RNA sequence: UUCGGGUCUUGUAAUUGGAAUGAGUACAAUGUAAAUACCUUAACGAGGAACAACUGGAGGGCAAGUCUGGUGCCAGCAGCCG
RNA sequence: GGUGAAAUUCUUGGAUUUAUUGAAGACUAACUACUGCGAAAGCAUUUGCCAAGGACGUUUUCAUUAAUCAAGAACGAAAGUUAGGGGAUCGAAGAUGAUCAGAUACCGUCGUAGUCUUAACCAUAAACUAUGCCGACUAGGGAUCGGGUGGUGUUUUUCUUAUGACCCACUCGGCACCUUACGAGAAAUCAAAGUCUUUGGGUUCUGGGGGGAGUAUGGUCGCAAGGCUGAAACUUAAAGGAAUUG
RNA sequence: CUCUAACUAUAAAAAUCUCUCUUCUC
């Protein structure tokens, strides 16, 4: 039976979208059923911020960030802990998991 | 509103649609194709005589463990050969080899009944006399 | 069994039967 | 496309009655709708309707009072012989004490009892009760 | 082994049973080949190869393999087929071998 | 007052009586072209009223047994479930 | 290199990485969304040309010219087939190196056909919203795309204004969405799967238990692959749908 | 009745299983 009224795709009026590959297993999966995660982070972690600051010329370097949108498959997304199985009454909710920190 | 047409001048397509759909049934298809006359062991026949060829028993299905005592009979009307079942405790011995036996339907519309595989016909009479009269010793086999 | 592989096995039977008929046509 | 206009009118009446309203706005407003609602007025199943001239098919505003429970067209206007009137009443009306199979005879659009009184019968339009 | 055993009848006849002989149609035979559908092929000690049904009280109650002495009941109406009725566990089979109810040319020993 | 008459009736018992009657035979007559047969009717014709009603079924569907003996997944039954 | 871990493989003829560059072919990242166009497949770099199209605006024009459709036709993903062109990547077959009891499977390295194209075929997909099309009505809440109306609205700046971009309100059309049952369902659920025993708006196609079987045969299309049409004999008491507790 | 910030990141191998299922009424 229908487990998802949206079918998981989130297409609703296209018929076909262009697939994208998984970052882990390289699964040719449609771009909308290709759960996306925008990893924006520091090129140097908080573990080495002090070390870099003490041992860097150009006092108060901006310490540029790194940006990458990861296109996971769905099997990896279940397994690589990105997305989790949910209650059938919890599948309703599409909001992100409540603002990890405020 | 519905798949069928509804106009006052749509009798033709309604009739032909019903006529084309009637073939989906099994009774109507059998009656019109005349499969009973051509392929069935008897053509529209409730009873049929035959000659006993050999005297075999067949094991039952899984939930039922036994060997039902049947008999292979070659029909006289056309020459077909069918297995048939002698229905009672001590009736196998009553029918002897190479005697005329009158087979009847098995009651399940020409299909195997119960736990007995590959049989579709009872045995009602043997050598002119009925099985039920022999089983209660009301009549005896003429032994001709 | 899958309908796919039953279909393919039927197609291979048709392979052999078509080659046989073409030999004897 | 709009094939049977009276069907649209009666469907609108049914929908606006089931929801508990007291008025309907029927758009196309032909002769047959006017006669049908006039018969319903004569028998009380409807209130005080209204024709709104548009110079284009007009419209109708229907007032209800909750007395009606179901309209409905017999979309193929079957030729109903005077012998088959009783069969239609049995198949459509819920009881013999009331209900009316509105049918169009050569003497106009009339309820089945009136047609049986005139001893005339024609095609069937719909049913009200 | 398994949890099946506790569901069983627990019919423990381990002690030496008294072997059953052949009676007016019941005859000894040897399993030649194992077939499917719970049916076996038995070479009887008469020069014939009968087809013997794995039979009630014997189907999933005792497990029998190739080259097993066996007792089988015939059917007078059909001689070709028969029914396996009892199985001898290789000890009383030796006793019958010495007493020689069966031709001794059929030597089956571990 | 235990009762209990059974005061008022309804069944069960190889107890026990008196009746009625055909199914059969059969003088006749009717019937029929002639005969059967039917309607009528002499004379016989019921006590175990032997003048003897079977056909299927008794787990459910489906009314009626978890009584007795026999066979032990045999024999067999069972339209289906069993 | 690569991996769970290894090995096959390339390397002091100096590989792997290091800087400029050059060649080829494919692709069009990030922008990319419960967003758009299209009859469906499908469509994502810029610019020009070619014609086409939906929606809106219209006190413009014809007046039933329309809806659905047997026969007939046009397109029809990927794969595949003939030839000509290319030939980067990735990779059916194959070659091996591993893992295993076996592994000619999954992990790995090479690797033809193919992938990319110009003509000619093919006409099948879980070609799915598993919901035919046209038409009417029925219930509340926001947003979103295209168009159009009004604002004594706001920033814009070209002194003011005209645009544009927003803000508020309304309307038409579209992909959609939230809540709810007062309706429908065997329910999962559906704002249509409602207005269906209170049964009839028009209309096309399909199904009558499972298997045999989308098989055989007979046509027909195709070079071939295969497509369309398409049973029975026989066998079976179930197969199946949704949901509840383990 | 007033607000848009923090972050990572594992995938060795594991095949198979035979009986036998049994009433719910005050
Ligand atoms: Mg599932
Ligand atoms: Mg998703
Ligand atoms: Mg669209
Ligand atoms: Mg057997
Ligand atoms: Mg125990
Ligand atoms: Mg009786
Ligand atoms: Mg009986
Ligand atoms: Mg009995
Ligand atoms: Mg009863
Ligand atoms: Mg170098
Ligand atoms: Mg781009
Ligand atoms: Mg867009
Ligand atoms: Mg067509
Ligand atoms: Mg191609
Ligand atoms: Mg080529
Ligand atoms: Mg390989
Ligand atoms: Mg290998
Ligand atoms: Mg590989
Ligand atoms: Mg490669
Ligand atoms: Mg198809
Ligand atoms: Mg389909
Ligand atoms: Mg069928
Ligand atoms: Mg099928
Ligand atoms: Mg053909
Ligand atoms: Mg299920
Ligand atoms: Zn993956």
Give the SSE map:
The structure is cut from a larger assembly and holds chains A (102 residues), B (144 residues), C (25 residues), D (129 residues) and E (110 residues).
Chain A: E1 19-20, E2 29-30, E3 36-42, H1 49-54, E4 65-71, H2 75-79
Antiparallel strand pairs in A: 1-2, 3-4
Chain B: H1 11-21, H2 27-33, H3 35-38, E1 47-54, E2 57-59, E3 67-75, E4 81-85, E5 100-105, E6 121-126, E7 129-130, H4 131-135
Antiparallel strand pairs in B: 1-3, 1-5, 2-3, 3-4, 5-6, 6-7
Chain D: H1 5-18, E1 23-26, H2 31-43, E2 50-52, E3 59-63, H3 85-92, E4 100-105, E5 108-110, H4 112-118, E6 123-128
Antiparallel strand pairs in D: 1-3, 2-3, 4-5, 4-6
The structure holds magnesium ion (25 copies) and zinc ion.
Chain B binds three RNA strands through residues 1-7, 10, 13, 21, 24-26, 29, 33, 35, 39-40, 60, 63-69, 87-90, 106-109, 111-115, 117-118.
Structure, explained:
Chain B: This is KLLA0B11231p. Chain B: Belongs to the universal ribosomal protein uS12 family. Chain B: One of its GO terms (molecular function) is structural constituent of ribosome. Chain B: One of its GO terms (biological process) is translation. This is part of a larger assembly, with chains A (102 residues), B (144 residues), C (25 residues), D (129 residues) and E (110 residues). Chain B is of the alpha+beta class and 144 residues long. Chain B is 19% helix and 27% strand. Chain B is elongated, with a radius of gyration of 22 Å. Chain C starts with a helix and ends with a helix. Chain C has one helix at 3-23. Chain E is globular, with a radius of gyration of 15 Å. Chain E has 110 residues and is mainly β. Chain E contains 1 helix and 5 strands; from the N terminus they run E-E-E-E-E-H. The chains are: A alpha+beta (102), B alpha+beta (144), C mainly alpha (25), D alpha+beta (129), E mainly beta (110). Chains in contact: B-D, B-E. Chain B binds chain E through residues 54-57, 59, 65-67, 69, 92, and chain E through 53, 56, 59, 75, 77-78, 83. Bound molecules: magnesium ion (25 copies) and zinc ion (ZN). One magnesium ion binds next to loops of chain B. The structure holds 3 RNA strands.
């Amino acid at each position: 039976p229908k487990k998802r009224a949206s079918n998981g795709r989130n297409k609703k009026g296209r018929g076909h979208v262009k697939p994208v590959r998984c970052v882990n297993c390289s699964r040719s999966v449609p771009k909308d059923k290709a759960i996306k995660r925008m990893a924006i982070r520091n090129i140097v972690e908080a573990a080495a911020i002090r070390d870099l600051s003490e041992a860097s010329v150009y006092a108060e370097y901006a310490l540029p960030k790194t940006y990458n949108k990861l296109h996971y498959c769905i099997s990896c997304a279940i397994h690589a802990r990105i997305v989790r199985v949910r209650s059938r009454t919890d599948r309703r909710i599409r909001a992100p998991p409540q603002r990890p920190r405020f | 509103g519905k798949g069928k047409p509804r106009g006052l001048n749509s009798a033709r397509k309604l009739r032909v649609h019903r006529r084309n759909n009637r073939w989906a049934e099994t009774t109507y298809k059998k009656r019109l194709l005349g499969t009973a006359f051509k392929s069935s062991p008897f053509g529209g026949s409730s009873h049929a005589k035959g000659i006993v060829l050999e005297k075999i028993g067949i094991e039952s299905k899984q939930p039922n463990s036994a060997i039902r005592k049947c008999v292979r009979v070659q029909l006289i009307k056309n020459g077909k050969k069918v297995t048939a079942f002698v229905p009672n405790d001590g009736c196998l011995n009553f029918v002897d080899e190479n005697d005329e036996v009158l087979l009847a339907g098995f009651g399940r519309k020409g299909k195997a009944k119960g736990d007995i595989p590959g049989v579709r016909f009872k045995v009602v009479k043997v050598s002119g006399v009925s099985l039920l009269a022999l089983w209660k010793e009301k009549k005896e086999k003429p032994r001709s | 069994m899958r309908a796919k592989w039953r279909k393919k096995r039927t197609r291979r039977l048709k392979r052999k039967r078509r080659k046989v008929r073409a030999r004897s046509k | 496309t709009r094939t049977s206009v009276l069907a649209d009118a009666l469907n609108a009446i049914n929908n606006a009655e089931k929801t508990g309203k007291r008025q309907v706005l029927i758009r196309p407003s032909s002769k047959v709708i006017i006669k049908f609602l006039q018969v319903m007025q004569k028998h009380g199943y409807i209130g005080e309707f209204e024709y709104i001239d548009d110079h284009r098919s007009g419209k109708i505003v229907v007032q209800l009072n909750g007395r009606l429970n179901k309209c409905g067209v017999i979309s193929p206007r079957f030729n109903v012989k005077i012998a088959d009137v009783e069969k239609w009443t049995a198949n459509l009306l819920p009881a013999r004490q009331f209900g009316y199979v509105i049918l169009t005879t050569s003497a106009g659009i009339m309820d089945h009892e009136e047609a049986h009184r005139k001893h005339v019968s024609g095609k069937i339009l719909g049913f009200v009760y | 082994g398994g949890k099946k055993g506790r569901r069983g009848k627990n019919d423990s006849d381990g002690p030496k049973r008294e072997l059953i002989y052949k009676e007016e149609g019941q005859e000894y035979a040897q399993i030649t080949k194992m077939l499917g559908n719970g049916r076996v092929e038995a070479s009887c000690f008469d020069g014939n190869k009968r087809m013997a049904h794995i039979r009630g009280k014997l189907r999933k109650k005792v497990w029998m393999g190739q080259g097993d002495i066996i007792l089988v009941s015939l059917r007078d109406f059909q001689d070709d087929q028969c029914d396996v009725v009892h199985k001898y566990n290789l000890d009383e089979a030796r006793t019958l071998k010495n007493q020689g109810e069966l031709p001794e040319n059929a030597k089956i020993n571990e």
